């Protein structure tokens, strides 16, 4: 799963 | 030294891709006790995300070597996984202590309170990726939930901080709780409420908000086979 | 005292995990056990330190580029000086490992040329950051290490040899980049290339690609030069 | 210029 990037 | 000297070196550190420096700078700024600006807050978060990010990625690689293995290579992978794991927990405990002792207690801004409670959920979630585990998972859920409740009360559903919180909370549900339905339910509601109100989102935050909305939809598509 | 097979295993684990500081530490303890290094161990030591100093070489360029564009510049400079201090620490560690172990242990001309090229390389990296009297002595040490390695390689090594070809490449770059002699560079590069292609047929299959690659990069540096 | 990328 993709979490929030910088 | 002066907070503004530490903040300047944190940005030089970030240009140099020296994120351990960046975190130590912003850790010092934070331990001075004054609350952080939005700039200082995001510099802190960038620093620790890259710092812990590097170890999470090393932890992934070595675990997969441990699983794919040949007694000796496996014992060496297992020991090196534990060495990285210990750094990982130190970094998370470092961040969690700053959040508990300085950032969450002193935040006069609802937005910063939501930002910091999301961050406490994040780093407990990183602890839980490698974790005792029931306790850490509960710490992550409760931080995310409080953050979420304040965000529904203080921000519009198109706010990037709120949208990003819903993204990570639904990742938490899918990956840490093995609960796809709640993950999907949280992400779809967050996306739908944002899309119903895009018409009045400020052009300054439109890119960041639609970007996160894209990520929410990316996950729901994958999650629903 | 520490089992060397374990340090070499973890050095490879560190390499895959992009933990080059760890990778250098493993190979530094191997080297410090006094025995001469196998080709694998020598190559591991070389990659590890090349990456550890590579990170500081790139950060130094970024920060030094900022330093050129009164309190902001003083912050950049202090940071730039912090990066140089680390860069000089790493280079000194390597140069000292060469002086105490690697060069005195080198049984054969292949080994000796490798380590004397390494010494030229790490004095070259010092040179890229050094100033004044310090620098002149630094640049001199580099030319001496490279030049002696060359003479050993002309005498004892088939021009075929990748180690001999890599030496000619970096020495020519030392001339080009550090000593501003474009005519000493291409000449060096031109010569070492066609000395090897003349005996390309003798090349063994375990060394064919390594030699031909360096030979390509010799020509590549030529085109840009 | 291009120095040797791998030993």
Q: How far is B58 from B54, CA to CA, in rounded Å?
A: 6
Indicate the residue of B12, B57, B80 with minimum beta-carbon distance to C13. Answer: B80
C-alpha C171, offset from chain centre: 10
Specify the 3-state DSSP secondary structure of B46. helix
Task: Kindly determine whether residue C217 and residue D4, on different chains, have CB atoms separated by under 8 Å.
Answer: yes
Torsion sign across C-alpha atoms C41, C47, C50, C54: negative
| DSSP type of residue B130 | -
CB hemisphere CA count around C111 (13 angstroms): 16
**If we measure between CA atoms, which residue out of B95, B135, B9, B36 comes closest to residue C72?**
B9
Maximum Cα–Cα distance for chain D, whole Å? Answer: 17
- Which residues, at least 6 apart from C195, have a Cβ–Cβ distance to it below 8 Å? C159
The residue with tokens 């639904």 is B170
Query: Chains contacting A with at least 3 CB pairs below 8 Å?
Result: B
Structure-block tokens of residue B15: 């240009």
Residues followed by a break in chain B (C to N exceeding 2.5 Å) are 69, 131
Query: How far apart (Å, rounded) are the C-alpha atoms in residues B82 and B77?
Result: 9
At B129, which helix (H) or strand (E)?
Answer: helix B110-129
Burial of C52 (0-12, 13-18, 19+ CB in 10 A): buried
Experimental approach was X-ray
Q: Are C52 and C88 in contact (CB under 8 A)?
A: no
Residue C169 touches partner D, C-beta closer than 8 Å: yes
Nearest to B175 among A1, A4, A6 (CB): A1
Residue B134 corresponds to which tokens in the numbers above?
A: 């029931």
Phi, psi of B53 (to 5 degrees): -55, -45
To the nearest whole Å, the CA of A2 is away from the closest chain B CA by 7
Give the ranges where C19-70 is alpha helix by DSSP (H): 20-31, 39-67
Q: Report residue C165: phi and psi, to 5°.
A: -75, -45
**Radius of gyration of chain A, Cα coordinates, nearest whole angstrom:** 5
Query: Half-sphere exposure of residue B80, counting CA atoms within 13 Å on the CB side?
Result: 33
Q: Which two tokens stand for residue C179?
A: 């000593």
* Closest-CA residue to D4 (of C129, C37, C172): C172
Q: How far is C142 from chain D (nearest CA, A)?
A: 15
- Give B219's contacts in chain A (Cβ within 8 Å): 1-2
C46: three-class secondary structure by DSSP: helix
C166, C167, C178, C211, best to mutate vs chain D, most D CBs in 10 Å: C166
Nearest partner of C159 among C201, C115, C120, judged by Cα: C201
Helix or strand or coil: residue B225?
A: coil
Q: Find how far residue C170's CA is from the centre of its chain.
A: 8
- Whether B167 and A3 lie within 8 Å, measured CB to CB: yes
| Placement of tokens 């940005």 in the chain | B11
Are B225 and B185 a contacting pair, CB within 8 Å? Answer: no
Helix (H, G, I), strand (E, B) or coil at B109: coil
Residue C114, Cβ neighbours under 10 Å: how many? 24
Q: Which residues of B touch C9 (CB under 8 A)?
A: 72-73, 76
SS3 C208: helix
DSSP-assigned letters across all residues of C138-204? HHHHHHHHHHHHHHHHHHHS-TT-HHHHHHHHHHHHIIIIIH--HHHHHHHHHHHHHHHHTT-TT--
Whole-number Å distance between alpha carbons of B38 and B112? 8
CA B54 to chain centre: 14
Helices B160-171, B203-223: inter-axial angle, 10-degree rounding = 20
B28: left (phi over 0), alpha (psi -120 to 50) or beta: alpha
Evaluate whether B107 touches B116 at the Cβ level (below 8 Å).
Answer: yes
Tell whether B129 lies on the interface with A, counting CB pairs under 8 A: no
> Rounded to a whole number, what is the distance in angstroms from the first to the last CA of chain C?
49
Give the resolution in Å: 2.4
The SS3 of residue C114 is helix
Residue D2 to chain C, least CA–CA distance (Å): 6
Taking CB atoms and an 8 Å limit, are C17 and B77 in contact across chains? no
CA distance C121 to chain D (A): 9
Task: Give Cα B82 to chain centroid, integer Å.
Answer: 22
Query: Across the interface, which of C17, C19, C63 has its CB nearest the CB of B15?
Result: C63
Cα–Cα distance, B92 to B203 (Å, whole number): 35
Among left, alpha and beta (phi > 0; psi -120 to 50; other), residue C158 is: beta
Of A1, A4, A6, the CB nearest to B212: A4
Residues in chain A: 6
Using the Cα atoms of residue B2, residue B3, residue B7 and residue B9 in order, give the sign of their dihedral.
Answer: positive
Nearest in space to B25 (alpha carbons), one of C78, C185, C137: C78
Backbone CA torsion sign across B116, B119, B124, B125: positive
C107: tokens are 């049984």
Q: What tokens were used for C102?
A: 């690697």
With left for phi above 0 and alpha for psi between -120 and 50, is residue B107 left, alpha or beta? beta
Contact D1 C166 (CB under 8 A): no
Distances in whole angstroms, Cα of residue B166 to Cα of each of B59, B184, B223: 26, 11, 15
- CB-neighbour burial class of residue B22 (10 A; exposed 0-12, middle 13-18, buried 19+): buried
| Sequence-separated (6 or more) residues with CB below 8 Å from residue C93 | C28, C49
Give the gap in angstroms from C-alpha C63 to the nearest C-alpha of chain B.
Answer: 6
Query: Is C217 an 8 Å CB contact of chain D?
Result: yes
For chain C, which domains are there? 1-225 (1.20.190.20)
Partner residue facing A4 (CB), from B50, B164, B222? B164
């Amino acid at each position: 799963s993709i979490s929030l990037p910088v | 030294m002066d907070k503004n000297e530490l903040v300047q070196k944190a940005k030089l550190a970030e240009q140099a891709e020296r994120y351990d420096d960046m975190a130590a700078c912003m850790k010092s700024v934070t331990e001075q006790g004054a609350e952080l600006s939005n700039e200082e807050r995001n510099l802190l978060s960038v620093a620790y995300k890259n710092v812990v990010g590097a170890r999470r990625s090393s932890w992934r690689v070595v675990s997969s070597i441990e699983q794919k293995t040949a007694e000796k290579k496996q014992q060496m992978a297992r020991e090196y996984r534990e060495k990285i794991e210990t750094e990982l927990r130190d970094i998370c405990n470092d961040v969690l202590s700053l959040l508990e002792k300085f950032l969450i207690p002193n935040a006069s801004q609802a937005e910063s309170k939501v930002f910091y409670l999301k961050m406490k959920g994040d780093y407990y979630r990183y602890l839980a990726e490698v974790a005792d585990k029931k306790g850490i998972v509960d710490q992550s859920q409760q931080a995310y939930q409080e953050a979420f409740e304040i965000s529904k009360k203080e921000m519009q559903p198109t706010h990037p901080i709120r949208l990003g919180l819903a993204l990570n909370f639904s990742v938490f549900y899918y990956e840490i709780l093995n609960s796809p339905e709640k993950a999907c339910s949280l992400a779809k509601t967050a996306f739908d409420e944002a899309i119903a109100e895009l018409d009045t989102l400020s052009e300054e935050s439109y890119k960041d908000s639609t970007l996160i909305m894209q990520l929410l939809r990316d996950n729901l598509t994958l999650w629903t086979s």
